[PDB]
């Protein structure tokens, strides 16, 4: 439903709850649509997340 394709992860931060959030480039959406998402929202994006974490 509110689920979209991830093009890439661009940055990360820890919020106030100590949860990692990731700055997402959404495939097919322009850079003004980028959003910070908590780690759980990346359930469908295992490969790009692990690449981001290892780099």
């Amino acid at each position: 439903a509110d689920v979209y394709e991830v093009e890439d992860i661009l940055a990360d931060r820890v919020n106030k709850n100590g949860i990692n959030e990731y700055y997402i480039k959404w495939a097919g959406y322009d850079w003004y649509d980028n959003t910070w998402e908590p780690e759980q929202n990346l359930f469908g994006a295992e490969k790009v997340l692990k690449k981001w974490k290892k780099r």
């Binding site: 991830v6 990346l42 469908g44 490969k47």
Partner: peptide, 7 residues
């Protein structure tokens, strides 16, 4: 194909 929930 990578998917995620967008707030």
């Amino acid at each position: 194909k990578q998917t995620a929930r967008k707030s």
